[PDB]
Every structure is written in C-alpha cells, then in structure tokens.
Symmetry: C2
C-alpha cells in the first residue's frame, strides 16, 4: 500500500465531525466517517519542531535531543545512528519518499547525513485553495523516475497556522462559536476564533481538492492515509502548552481495507504513527522505538501519553506532562516563572493576549481566565478531564486526589529515567543568547512593520488588533 | 591675556541653593555665584548633550550647522561648514593652548572635524569619587610640561548630574522635604529619585570645591575667568529632551579676573552666547556670522529672545521649536499627531518616574497638570506666561486674549527659521533613521532582559524593580 501522512498545522478537535458548531468541514468529516476517527490522539509537544521531530522518528523529542524549539540546526548534531527516520524504514521496504504540500519544511531539531525524502517540491500567508499539488516537482519526479515502487508521502499544509484567513464562501458568525472557558467571552476573542475556524474551512477545501487529484491519478485504491494535526490550535493557552488544547489533535485513518464508521477512544500519541505505518507495510518495529502500534492485530495499548515543553523560541521553560484517559498531570520544573513569560510570537500574533492583559489589569478576567496570568505556577497540576475538560480546576492540592497525583508523579519520574530525558540538561549560554538575539531582532522588525512601540500598552495594542481583524475580514 | 575655563556640568536645572532650592547643600557653587555674576535667565539651545554642546562650542544653534539630530554625522564625512569655526580655533588664534579636562572626555559633536578640537586631553554614567585630582591627569600635566608660557582655554566636563544618580551619605537629603514641580506626582518614588538627583548635585559641588583648591594651589586663579554652566536642564522626564524651562534653563556663573562680586543678572542669555563673550574677553572680534550675543562688557548686545529646538533624540523622531522672551514661552510642535510620550529607550530605561506616571495614568490618578504629558497628541502651538505659570502647565495658545502674543512669537519663529536656514526642516535619510531606531530599541530589549524584566513589563511590575533600584542607590 502507498502511505500518506497528511499533516495539518496547529489544529485542535475543531472539525464539524468532532462536534464543533458552525464550522463547515465536509471533506475531513467524510474521511473520518469513511474510516477510523480518533478522539484521544496527542502530540508529544505543542510546537512544530518538537512535535514533528518526534512523529517522524517514533521517539519523544527529549529522548533524541530535539526538545528545544528550535535547536541543532547547524552545529554538527546528527540524529543518533540507532534512531532512524521514518523514511529510512520505508526505503528499506522499497518505498520512495515524497515531501509534498505547500509547507516544504521538516522542522527537525537536528541535521541528518542522508536525505529525509527522495523527492520534494522545493506569520504565514495561506495560498489559494486551487493548488495542484500533484503537478509540483515531488509527485512529477515520482511518476516519471520511479516505476513499480509504492510511495510514502508527507503532505504538509500551512493551515491552520496564523495568520488566519477569511472564508467568504461560508463566513462564520462570531456570536455563535464555542469558546473555551479560559478565554474571555468577548468580541475580540470571537472574531479571532471565527477566522481560525474559517481557516479550517479553507484547508478542508484543499483536502477535498487533493483527494480529487489522487482519485484522478488512480492511487486511492491502494493508499492508506493518516490525517492529523502536528499539535493543537494557535490560541494563547493551547499551542506551546501541555493542556489538551495544545496536545490533542484530529487523527483519521482512511483507506481501502480500513472499515468505515469506526470511532476510537483509546490513547494514541503521535509517536505511534511511525510504528503503526511500519506495521501496516509489513515491517517489524525495532525494540528501541518508543511509539506503540495502535491498529491491527499487533496493536499495543497505552496506559499513558507524555509530552514536554522546553525552550520555545526565546522563552526558556521546563514542563512535563503525563496523561491517562481521565487525568492530566503537569509538572512545572521552574515554578517561579509565570506562564505569561515573554514570548515574541505570542505577543506579535495573538490578539487575545493583548485582550487578556488589558482585562487582567482592570480585574475583568474570570477566575478561570486569570489562572494563566498569575506571577508564578504551582509545581504540579492535576486535572480530572472527565469533570473538567477545560483543565481549569487544579486538583494537586486536594488531598482526596493525592494518591492519583503520586501515581502520576511517580510515572513521570520513571519515564524520565527510562528515556534519559535530555531536556534535563541545560542548553549552553551561547545558544540561549543567540535565540534571545534572534527574537529581539525578529520582534523589533515585526513591530516596526506595524508602526507600533515595542512597549505598547495592552489597550493601545487592542486598537491595532481591532483594525487588523477588520482587515482580515471579521 | 587671561586663562579661560568653561566648567560644564551635565543635566542640571536652577537647583542650586543660591538659586533658592530648598534642602540641597551647594556651598562651593553658591560661593562662586556670590563672588561673581549669577545669571537667572541662561538657556541652552537644545535639551540633550550633543545638540547643546555642538551649539555652545560654535556660537551657533545646532540647526544652523546641521548638527540638530542627537546623535548624527558621527562618521559620514560631514564636516563643520568651513565658515564655522570651533571655539578653540579662535583661542588658538589668540595664542591659547586648548585643554579638554574633567571625567567626561567627550565633545559630543554631531559632525566631524579635520582640525583637533583640543590640543591636549586626559584620554548611564557612574560618577567617580569626589577625591579626583583633575590637575594630575594628562591634559594639565601636558600643559605645564610643554606649554606653561601660553594662556590656556580649558573645558572641564563633569559627569554629574547625569544618571545614574549617586547618593551623598555625608549630607543625605530628606525626600519628604524636597521641592517637586507640579507636573510630577507628589509621591515617594518621585521624591526618592529627586533626593538622589539633589545629592548628585551636592557631589559635584564637592568636586568643584576640590577643583578650585587645586587651581588656587597651582597659582593660576588670579589671571583666570571661569564660566560655570550646565549643558541643559535636569535629567527628569519632562525636563531633559523637552523645550520647557526645565529642559533649557541652566545655572550660569561668571567668576574671576575683572569680575566684580555680588552681581545678579536677569537678562536673556543663550549658551551660544558663551563663545562670543569669551572671544571678546580675550581681545578678539566676533565674526558677523556668529549667532550668539556678547553678554558681558562694553560690547554687550541685548537679546529680545532665545531660541531652542528638538529634532531626533536617540531614536525618537520629533520636530519642535521654541521662542522665549523674558516673560513668554512659545513652543511649536511640527508633528502634533505624535504623543509627547513617544517611545524613547533612554527615558524608559533610566527614569523611575516614567513608570510611576504610566501606572498612575492608567489608574486615572494623575492630576490634570501631570496628565498633559500623557495625551495621545499635542497642540500644534503652546504658549506660557512664565511669570504667572512658572511650571508651564497652562497653555494659553487657544485663549484669544493672548493671540496677539501668540502671533508675534509665531512670526518670530518663522523669521528666525528663514534667517538661520534651519536644517532641522530637512528630513534625515531612511538609512539613518532606521539605523538608530534599531540601535536603541535593541538597547531597550537588551537592558530589560539584563535586569530580568520583560520588554512588555507592566508599569506596576516595573515599579517593583524601580523601588529596589532606588534602595540600592541609597534612598
Ligand atoms: Ca505546527
Ligand atoms: Ca547633558
């Protein structure tokens, strides 16, 4: 079978098929209903490079030294020889490996000395929906230079990363969207959210167009497709953080031989996609691989999933998470750091951060919304996600949950030792200072293009954000 | 031919005891004033280092010589126009050797030269101990070894009273007793910062006493005339960089040979008048191009007005001009849409009261007078009756009872700009503006991280830092 990994950016379970109001996602809904829809799939981290380094190797990024977003780009650090890329396994089974889709990035926090792919095509701005992915160089090279070989293709879209784009074919009514309780119920929040869902509608159209191309090529009879987000949506407490908003992603498995109308509620981590793919194409998974096979007779159930947060751009941190089907455990190794520690990306791109800072100063946030704006953090957080799906009622200090807290604390310690978590080793001063310098130059370049002061007050910034949203179309 | 000293203090308003300032102890500067001529109406032509100093070293407004942007023309082949001489070129012509002395070994010119500004030299500020021995440093040692047969012109630059302010633990000032202008909040943060400013004045007063004892022992004082003056007004939020009297009005004392004691002068003097007056004292004619007036002696020429300007200040772009007679201040903001509180890294990094006022403004706690600086835009014209409004907080420009005075001063500014061919009316290049905007906004992010602070820190969080900073300073 050919294998496709169709990777969406920065998206939570916000498709219509997952129960989300107002959004129109017919093509992804149809793929889900025609195959298996997963309700408990989790990335191992909540930004691009660490989620993607992980799922392309079947290993948590912390196990392979890739835990800092970004790092090891040009310093002679190579993936350890025992750790193979997905494409090395597929090459062994006779596959040709293709990098397709507008996002021609691997986002690895390491170099390699063999190519990750055999052929490739080449704030983001999303390209028109009428893209013809199969007429670009990766696919053209495949069909012309390779005969009788199955393909493994990673197809990366830029949606739904910011900047969000309007969908004037089916515009979304901001007053009707469902907002998590940890953002303010406010016009700014809802307009930004409406554009997020309209960006999902835009990529949904693109997925429909891809499948039209694939059917026309005649490859849909012997192709299995994994569709999944790299991590959760680009909203303030979701992306970069280890709550369900940052970790839980759509995951659909589809193709001839995959029975339709299945819904799966078992724990899956994105590092499971590689071993499951190997198993699907007849390969044994090496013992070193941390991911589990989640489909077929060889599946291995999980008791837990795990995730990490280490440096993110210039913002240093050290956070770990353990989740079973019911409980989320989070450990902040640096409790003295605020959650809202300076991050240029969040301040530059997220109108709701300005909104919440403005409202926090005026004492207008709800109790649940204000938790993110405390000056420091509890060392441990424990959430009963059955009774508290938005993870705003920390149970870690409630002695009635202490046995559960200690179980999960102990599991995190066991896991860190078994995987030799490399995020426990500080980065060098030269590296941290480099990225401090990098994101000061980026911040100021971007704030300059807007004519705003680097020290702009939240209320003045909101004037800008209202105009920005109006120009986006909401 | 008498020796000439220009003793230049940094960033200081009329805040000496002899000018009527409570609590501060300035016995040495007081005595110098009382032993000579004290000037009550001396004004810089700009309110930051390079533009005021480029001006007083040439007798020309900085705008007349292309030096109006602080800083600029450091390394681009821009030279002082050949008709414009530096003070030291005139003094060289009269047989003087020119000495650059004091801890601040800088000229701060917004232009290059092809002739040295001085003949001998020694070599956030941190102020050196009061026991400094300026005559034991290389400028004076060179003078006495190589040129003792010539009269000297010396510019002696102190670092006080620029920030960071330094505590004076020998005569500590009680913050609860200092006199604060009405446009800053009567608040502990304001008063602690202000007490340290006044203790920094006390520190430089001690140094000035030590300098005069050393000059006396050197045997040169009998044949020396000394001009003591600030380069512009005090390093407080609405004073330095701005064209209110807090930014422009400076101590000025003339003392020594031929200078009769116990004289007080209430006439308009601009710092560009110091050079022509010095030329006249040493027996030179002043060329007609010089914009400064001789203010002392038989050739004195009275002023009707003084003038000042504000153009780019570090990264902050602006265009402001001022005209002042003895009574009225006129200020024209050429870019009224810009707020007064346009981002300036220096003010945000160095001024605790900026964080205090931003915090208080957000809580609606500033008085009406204090809130004027925090408006989102400016009136194109400001007019103040300084006799009745010495803090310049009651703008009369929209009061038709003062329109004749407004139009008189408006017209004088236009006349002056046309007569002097004001170069600040010509935009700087994009390459220059972008260079400095980057340079300083980088500096802001850098120093904020070094203090462990976010560049977007709230004013109230910044005030937690500023309290600890003041405590570490000693107040
Ligand atoms: Ca992503
Ligand atoms: Ca100065």
């Amino acid at each position: 079978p050919n294998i496709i990994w169709l990777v969406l950016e920065d998206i939570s379970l916000d498709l219509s098929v997952y129960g989300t109001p107002e959004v129109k996602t017919p093509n992804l809904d149809r793929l889900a209903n025609e195959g298996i829809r997963y309700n408990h799939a989790y990335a191992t981290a909540a930004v691009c490079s660490t989620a993607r380094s992980a799922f392309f190797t079947g290993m948590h990024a912390t196990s392979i030294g890739a835990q800092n977003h970004r790092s090891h780009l040009d310093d002679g650090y190579y993936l350890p020889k025992n750790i193979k890329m997905t494409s090395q396994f597929m090459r062994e089974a006779g596959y040709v490996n293709l990098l397709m889709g507008p996002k021609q990035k691997t986002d690895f926090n390491f170099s390699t000395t063999i190519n990750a792919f055999d052929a490739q095509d080449g704030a983001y701005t999303h390209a028109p929906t009428d893209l013809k992915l199969l007429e670009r160089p990766a696919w053209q090279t495949y069909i012309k230079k390779y005969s009788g070989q199955p393909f493994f293709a990673q197809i990366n879209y830029s949606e739904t990363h910011r900047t969000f784009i309007a969908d004037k074919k089916n515009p979304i009514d901001p007053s009707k969207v469902k907002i998590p309780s940890y953002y303010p119920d406010h016009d700014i929040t809802r307009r930004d959210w409406a554009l997020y869902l309209e960006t999902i509608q835009t990529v949904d159209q693109k997925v429909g167009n891809l499948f039209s191309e694939l059917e026309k090529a005649g490859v849909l009879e012997n192709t299995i497709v994994f569709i999944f987000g790299d991590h959760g949506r680009a909203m303030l407490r979701d992306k970069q953080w280890l709550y369900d908003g940052g970790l839980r992603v759509p995951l659909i498995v589809w193709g001839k031989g995959i029975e339709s109308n299945q819904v799966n509620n078992e724990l899956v981590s994105l590092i499971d996609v590689m071993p499951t793919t190997l198993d699907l194409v007849g390969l044994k998974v090496p013992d070193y691989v941390e991911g589990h096979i989640f489909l077929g007779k060889n599946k291995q159930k999980r008791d837990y999933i795990y995730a990490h947060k280490d440096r993110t751009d210039e913002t240093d941190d050290r956070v770990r998470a353990v989740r079973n089907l019911r409980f989320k455990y989070i450990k902040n190794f640096y409790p003295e750091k605020p959650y809202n520690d300076f991050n240029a990306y969040k301040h530059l791109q997220y109108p709701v951060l300005a909104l919440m800072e403005s409202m926090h100063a005026k004492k207008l946030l709800t109790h649940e919304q204000a938790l993110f704006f405390a000056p420091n953090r509890p060392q441990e957080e424990l959430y009963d996600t059955f009774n508290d799906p938005d993870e705003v009622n920390n149970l870690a200090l409630n002695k009635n949950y202490e046995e559960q807290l200690l179980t999960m604390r102990k599991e995190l310690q066991r896991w860190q030792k078994a995987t030799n978590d490399q995020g426990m080793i500080d980065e060098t001063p030269e590296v941290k200072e480099y990225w401090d310098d990098f994101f000061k130059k980026h911040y100021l370049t971007q704030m300059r293009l807007r004519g705003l002061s680097p020290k702009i007050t939240p209320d003045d910034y909101l004037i800008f954000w209202d105009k920005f949203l109006t120009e986006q179309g909401k």
